[PDB]
Write a protein that binds this DNA or RNA. Structure first.
Ligand SMILES: [Mg+2]
Ligand SMILES: [Mg+2]
Ligand SMILES: [Mg+2]
Ligand SMILES: [Mg+2]
Ligand SMILES: [Mg+2]
Ligand SMILES: [Mg+2]
Ligand SMILES: [Mg+2]
Ligand SMILES: [Mg+2]
Ligand SMILES: [Mg+2]
Ligand SMILES: [Mg+2]
Ligand SMILES: [Mg+2]
Ligand SMILES: [Mg+2]
Ligand SMILES: [Mg+2]
Ligand SMILES: [Mg+2]
Ligand SMILES: [Mg+2]
Ligand SMILES: [Mg+2]
Ligand SMILES: [Mg+2]
Lengths: 250, 308, 99, 72, 115, 158
RNA sequence: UUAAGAGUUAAACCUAGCCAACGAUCCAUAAUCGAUAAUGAAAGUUAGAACGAUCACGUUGACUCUGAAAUAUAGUCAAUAUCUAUAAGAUACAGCAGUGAGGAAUAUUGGACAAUGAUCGAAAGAUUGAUCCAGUUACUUAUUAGGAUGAUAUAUAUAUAUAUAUAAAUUGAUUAAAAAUAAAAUCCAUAAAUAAUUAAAAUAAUGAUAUUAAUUACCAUAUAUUUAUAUGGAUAUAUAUAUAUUUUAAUAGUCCUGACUAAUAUUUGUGCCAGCAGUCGCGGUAACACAAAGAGGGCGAGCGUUAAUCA
């Protein structure tokens, strides 16, 4: 039996009571407000645990089940805070032992419902520099470095390319203070990883704007075939991108 | 593509590929998808709703059907084979931007692409549907990445009023410190866990007038001398940048900060490399999704038959 | 580069009148300037009001003058007096009846 | 139930149900006929189209307007 | 162009984006009908080049794929190439200057054969 | 779309590739041997038997296969300028150069086609001759299988 | 007779055969096919529009010349129907536009031979309703068709959970009943426009398309390897030179909500009537099914319905 079910919170929350007729409020909005907490004059929600990013290389992901739906905490002391019948946030009646009892992997699990999802580790900048020096300068092949550092070859090659771009930007100082701040912030939000054919180029006399290039090919294999299927007016219309990035019909 | 409408409605409670606060709450309160007391068709429909709200909301249904690949790829724990239902979308350029944390949404990444801020191997790509091959390197203009991962720049009026309030509270603090300095210092240490000149060093600030400061931002810049924001209106250190200029991470960023496996990211340069297509492995899937394997398999059975 | 006027072709107007094909109406457009005749392409001719057939023909004859090949007029092909092949039989039947 | 006897352009003769709240069809009106039978009436195998020929759209129709030839 | 057998270009592709098929065909048959043989393909549009690459010194390249040994067989038999096919084959070195015409100086780049 | 799967998933047809030499060459001995080998008559037979009469107005045996001599085609078709009788001509030199190129091209084509046929036939024959080694080594492996036999009748042998 | 076999056609003379319930003969219908299109897990089934291959025809029938090849879109004769020139006349749009009829229904009385071909010519070059382009038509397919932030408005007095008041607060409802982050507002963009310039289709030259694609938001050069600081022509200003250097958005329908079958937030009108309906079926004062309001669920520049094909 399927029913159009308004997505009310699974946890218990303080619902509406008798309301002024002109309030025009909904329970979902109250749940929103209780999840967030008071709104600062700056527009912030400091009371929430998720307003501010972490800074100790331990990602902070939503844990509504392990929190029983209580998502408010003191911004400084970081001790839990919960709503009260008085209407002012105050200390909980009892300790929530399950917030203390977090599995090692669940700390790295982004979404509660999907256990298989996990966040990759960020390589330390020193490790990136070490890989770049080992490959570019010493000459150790990507296989050797991957075996050395427990990494995959394509990741190693991507690291080399990115460190090349980083080197160029640092040479020109194209990096800005905002970019450095974002880099340092994001780096601290994630756990840190611990260690032939015949070709003829035709003659180009002066004033020619382009050069013919002839590639050898065999009859029965070269050409556009006659009676080929026309897919343009069909859903499987083939589309590609020219090297300029222009969309073309391939 | 689909015209965005009621994407973040709390009644519907569908999680979207976004860093928004409303999306955060919708993810928070959902718990898990309810597939119980439902026929097979109803289970498939619920799985479609939940999964298709996240993976490709913009894609048209009759377009997603054509894009959908009935044959998946997989390289003791159990392999989650059917989480790869939507792995085909992970090679699209906009999805790559969103997963690289170069945008706060797939739609925002789409606008970044369509507005010419994105390059793939050094050629400006203006088409969100461009598919990334393994080893491709794609980059975004750093200003747009900083805007995506930064707080909204306040208007002049909003930040001016915020400064008004900050002056009011700073004057309050120094007043109370002057009245009762010794225990003020001791109790401040109480949180941190006597020199009477301490309160003497602190200096008042003059309340500003909105009517007189309106429309004169260079004047307002000189008129503010708070200890923390010296000579700039709040959030507008350089008012010619697209973001909160004393660069501040956007609110509610920790919940959605997943580092993808298939991409290798360089935040300092706003570059990324597409290592591979996402592949399921024993006990882990590289398709970042908020739904469990049962939901994905129900969606997969739906799309195999096209709803039959 | 520009080729110099010949004694056969002193000025632009001589060239226009010689090549014919009703092109002699374009004397004003060129303003008798040899150099401008031998410098601009069909985009400028299009802007200046020359229609398709003309500007193509004048560029052809300009090229002929550049490579020294003669620029004499060759009249565009006309249909037969009795008429086109498809209508020739009926027209001959009518014409012979009238005479 | 309102039905009409219709001679088609191929020469056949059929019985067609006139849907909608109000029919503006009289004798010798020009109509367009589509398939579909009036389930509770035996012998009316066809549906007259509303909004074509001499049949107008259902007056003051505001839902399923397309099926009944209405405008908005 | 004369004779029954002619080496021509048959137009393939879509509107506003021609590509051509170097074919050996009957003169009397339609341009886009199936020919005696398909000797190659010719993409007229030059490969676009970056403004930087213009300064570096490369030029746009036009892609022709051809069967060199078979085209020699057809030229030997007396198949008569067309003007565009004559231009293409003459640049390839298959045809020498004997096929040049009066209507058609220095060499920046001489023809080169490589693997 | 289904039928294309039979041909490597290729939609559209090329014209059937033509043959430079329409009939086997003389140097291609194998086709001559098959052609001039004894004709089999029997359950699987190709010709009228010895005492059997063929129809009065028909030929008893099929038309003989005319084997091309590549030298003969090159001499008759292509040939050579018998004499160098000529003078300076705007068209004469052009035509001579054209004809020389065409002559060279057709000669090369015929020779290369003969060469590919010969090399291919030798290739197939060689492959079969090496496969003979596999057969004979298998037979040798049967010897060692039955070298260790005590001559008692065995069920597998029964 | 033919280049050529054969009761293929004509002549002559013999024999009595040949086909047939595994369907002859006759009748009706149909152009056939693919490495084409649709569908299915597949065998297959359907179409034969589009791309391509073969055949037949060019108002109807027969015959003749030429020719290698023709019962030719040729010629003669006749038939049908029109026109004038009234003659041992011409024409037959199944060539491109276009008109009338028939139909549920299928477009421009368009531009250019610039390209790729065809014909003529020694050549220059000429012709080309082939062809290439554009026009009309959502008929089909693809890409765009805006992101981020966002539940209040006033007054008070190197820290930071700021707190107090008052005022208002649309629809529905009195709480897990919502509409609704939806609006507005704010931040930031881009399209279009406006300026420049500007390829490529084509080269010896020739560009219909074309008010070209695309690039930059003053213009170049001079270095580095896209971002920069410089030199030089712009630029109004105030008073050669400190300054800045076009502007700028937002635009969604159509079907459905008893089950099949996704659609709980509820109300009104009607009362076996009006009506709905693919099947079950609904409609007699309490209609989740008719007609509507609210809310909701699909698909979305399409949605539904009819007609057909496959499963
Ligand atoms: Mg239901
Ligand atoms: Mg003449
Ligand atoms: Mg028929
Ligand atoms: Mg049939
Ligand atoms: Mg037919
Ligand atoms: Mg066809
Ligand atoms: Mg047609
Ligand atoms: Mg005929
Ligand atoms: Mg007719
Ligand atoms: Mg006839
Ligand atoms: Mg017509
Ligand atoms: Mg032409
Ligand atoms: Mg014309
Ligand atoms: Mg009310
Ligand atoms: Mg209805
Ligand atoms: Mg119903
Ligand atoms: Mg569409």
């Amino acid at each position: 039996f399927s029913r159009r079910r308004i997505a009310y919170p699974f946890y218990p929350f303080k619902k509406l009571g008798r309301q002024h007729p002109k309030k025009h409020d909904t329970n979902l909005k109250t749940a929103m407000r209780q999840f967030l907490g008071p709104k600062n004059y700056k527009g912030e929600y400091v009371m929430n645990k998720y307003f501010t990013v972490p800074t100790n290389h331990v990602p902070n992901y939503i844990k509504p089940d392990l929190e029983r739906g209580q998502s408010l905490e003191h911004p400084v002391t970081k001790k839990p805070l919960q709503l009260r019948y008085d209407g002012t946030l105050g200390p909980p009646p009892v300790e929530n032992k399950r917030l203390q009892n977090i599995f090692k992997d669940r700390l790295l699990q982004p979404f509660p419902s999907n256990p298989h999802c996990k966040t990759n580790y960020v390589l330390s900048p020193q490790l990136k520099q070490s890989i770049f020096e080992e490959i570019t300068v010493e000459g150790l092949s990507a296989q050797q470095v991957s075996q050395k550092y427990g990494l995959k070859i394509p990741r190693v090659e991507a690291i080399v390319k990115l460190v090349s771009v980083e080197n160029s930007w640092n040479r020109r100082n194209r990096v800005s203070s905002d970019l450095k701040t974002m880099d340092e912030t994001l780096y601290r939000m994630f756990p840190v990883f611990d260690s032939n054919t015949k070709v003829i180029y035709g003659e180009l006399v002066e004033g020619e704007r382009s050069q013919y290039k002839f590639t050898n090919a065999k009859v029965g294999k070269v050409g556009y075939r006659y009676g080929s299927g026309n897919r343009d007016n069909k859903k499987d219309r083939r589309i590609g991108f020219n090297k300029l990035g222009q969309m073309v019909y391939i | 593509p689909r015209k965005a409408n009621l994407l973040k409605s709390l009644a519907r409670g569908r999680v979207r590929t976004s860093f928004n606060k409303y999306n955060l709450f919708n993810l928070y309160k959902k718990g898990g998808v309810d597939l119980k007391s439902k026929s097979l068709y109803q289970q498939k429909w619920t799985a479609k709703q939940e999964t298709r709200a996240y993976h490709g909301e913009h894609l048209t249904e009759k377009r997603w059907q054509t894009v959908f690949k009935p044959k998946l790829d997989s390289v003791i724990k159990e392999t989650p084979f059917l989480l790869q239902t939507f792995a085909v979308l992970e090679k699209r350029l906009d999805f790559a931007l969103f997963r690289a944390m170069f945008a706060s949404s797939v739609r925002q990444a789409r606008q970044f692409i369509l507005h010419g801020n994105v390059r793939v191997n050094g050629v400006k790509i203006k088409h969100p549907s461009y598919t990334l091959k393994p080893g491709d390197m794609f980059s975004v203009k750093p200003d747009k990445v900083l805007e995506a991962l930064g707080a909204k720049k306040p208007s002049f009026q909003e930040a001016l009023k915020i400064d008004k309030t900050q002056i009011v509270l700073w004057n309050k603090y120094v007043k109370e410190a002057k009245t009762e300095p010794k225990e003020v210092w001791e109790k401040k240490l109480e949180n941190f866990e006597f020199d009477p000149k301490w309160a003497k060093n602190l200096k008042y600030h003059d309340p500003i007038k909105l009517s007189e400061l309106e429309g004169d931002e260079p004047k307002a810049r000189k008129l503010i001398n708070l200890p923390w924001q010296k000579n700039y209106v709040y959030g507008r250190q350089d008012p010619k940048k697209p973001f909160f200029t004393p660069w501040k991470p956007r609110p509610f960023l920790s919940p959605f900060a997943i580092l993808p496996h298939h991409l290798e990211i360089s935040f300092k340069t706003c570059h990324a490399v597409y290592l591979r297509d996402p592949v399921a492995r024993p006990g882990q899937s590289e398709v970042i999704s908020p739904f469990d394997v049962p939901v994905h398999e129900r969606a997969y059975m739906y799309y195999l038959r096209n709803g039959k | 580069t520009i080729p110099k006027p010949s004694d056969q072709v002193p000025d632009v107007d001589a060239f226009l009148n010689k090549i014919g094909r009703n092109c002699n109406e374009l004397k004003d457009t060129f303003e008798n300037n040899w150099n401008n005749l031998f410098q601009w392409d069909s985009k400028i001719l299009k802007e200046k009001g020359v229609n398709i057939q003309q500007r193509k023909y004048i560029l052809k004859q300009v090229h002929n003058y550049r490579n020294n090949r003669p620029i004499h007029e060759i009249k565009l092909g006309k249909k037969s007096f009795f008429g086109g092949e498809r209508k020739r039989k009926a027209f001959t039947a009518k014409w012979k009846a009238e005479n | 139930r309102k039905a009409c006897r219709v001679r088609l352009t191929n020469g056949n003769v059929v019985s067609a149900y006139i849907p909608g709240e109000g029919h503006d069809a009289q004798e010798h009106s020009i109509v367009y006929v589509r398939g579909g039978r009036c389930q509770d009436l035996p012998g009316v195998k066809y549906h007259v189209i509303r909004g074509a020929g001499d049949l107008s759209g259902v007056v003051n129709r505001i839902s399923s307007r397309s099926k009944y030839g209405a405008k908005k | 162009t004369c004779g029954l057998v002619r080496i021509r270009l048959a137009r393939f592709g879509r509107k506003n984006s021609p590509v051509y098929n170097i074919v050996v065909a009957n003169s009397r048959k339609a341009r886009d009908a199936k020919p005696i043989e398909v000797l190659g393909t010719y993409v007229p549009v030059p490969s676009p080049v970056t403004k930087r690459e213009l300064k570096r010194g490369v030029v746009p390249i036009k892609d022709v794929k051809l069967d060199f040994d078979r085209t020699k067989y057809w030229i030997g038999v007396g198949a008569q190439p067309s003007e565009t096919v004559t231009k293409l084959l003459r640049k390839a070195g298959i045809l020498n200057d004997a096929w040049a015409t009066s209507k058609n100086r220095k060499v920046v780049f001489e023809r080169m054969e490589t693997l | 779309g289904k039928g294309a799967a039979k041909y490597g998933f290729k939609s559209g047809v090329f014209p059937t590739t033509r043959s430079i030499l329409k009939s086997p060459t003389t140097k291609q001995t194998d086709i001559i041997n098959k052609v001039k080998s004894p004709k089999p008559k029997g359950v699987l037979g190709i010709g009228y038997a010895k005492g059997v009469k063929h129809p009065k107005g028909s030929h008893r045996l099929s038309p003989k296969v005319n084997f091309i001599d590549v030298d003969n085609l090159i001499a008759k078709t292509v040939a050579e300028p018998q004499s160098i009788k000529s003078s300076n001509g705007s068209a004469q030199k052009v035509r001579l150069q054209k004809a020389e190129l065409r002559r060279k091209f057709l000669i090369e084509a015929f020779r290369k086609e003969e060469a590919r046929l010969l090399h291919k036939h030798e290739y197939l024959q060689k492959r079969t001759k090496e496969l003979e080694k596999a057969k004979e080594l298998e037979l040798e492996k049967l010897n060692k299988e039955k070298s260790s036999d005590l001559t008692i009748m065995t069920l597998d042998k029964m």
